[PDB]
Design a protein around this ligand. Structure first.
Ligand SMILES: Cc1c(C(=O)NCc2ccc(N)cc2)cnc2cc(=O)[nH]n12
Length: 164
């Protein structure tokens, strides 16, 4: 079945709880596998210890730059970047999990969780999963963002992994 993975998130060193994500490997297997392996850390690198560096209320929470911690970095398990697998899944509402990018075919490790329907991203960002549990944690993260994306608390993925 599709992988279930988790992110345990702190804000200014206090735990907020756990976000559980389903990865739609049946639709986007290569994109799902990248995220799964970055959660487990099994390639020797991944999301553990990295941050939500860009958070915009009423839009999304973005994370996954585990190399530069600022939106310029990250890498995939395949290499620095990998192609857009497909655009079949849509940005239908809060809880959608999608790949950040710098244009076509520039997926790495950065990702975002939507807090609203973001239909204008359809066909531009690869959707690959959704929140199963922990939308309350996502809403807390969102509340620590700003219009500019700068966070008002340090939001850290302290632990992450695969549940099934
Ligand atoms: C524009 C931007 C990006 C961005 O698009 N980075 C390019 C990129 C994405 C994914 C991969 N894998 C590689 C490169 C990342 N963070 C922030 C914060 C902010 O205020 N603007 N911003």
């Amino acid at each position: 079945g599709n992988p279930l993975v988790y992110l345990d998130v702190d804000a200014n060193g206090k735990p907020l709880g756990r976000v559980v994500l389903e990865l739609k490997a049946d639709v986007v297997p290569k994109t799902a596998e990248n995220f799964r392996a970055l959660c487990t850390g099994e390639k020797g690198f991944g999301y553990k210890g990295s941050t939500f560096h860009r958070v915009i209320p009423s839009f999304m929470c973005q994370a996954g730059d585990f190399t530069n911690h600022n939106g310029t970095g990250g890498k995939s398990i395949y290499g620095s970047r990998f192609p857009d697998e497909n655009f079949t899944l849509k940005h239908v509402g809060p809880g959608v999990l999608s790949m950040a990018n710098a244009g076509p075919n520039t997926n790495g490790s950065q990702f975002f969780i939507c807090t609203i329907k973001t239909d204008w991203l359809d066909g531009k960002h690869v959707v690959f999963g959704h929140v199963i549990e922990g939308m309350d944690v996502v809403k807390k993260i969102e509340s620590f963002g700003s219009k500019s994306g700068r966070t008002s608390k340090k939001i850290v993925i302290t632990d992450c992994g695969q549940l099934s």
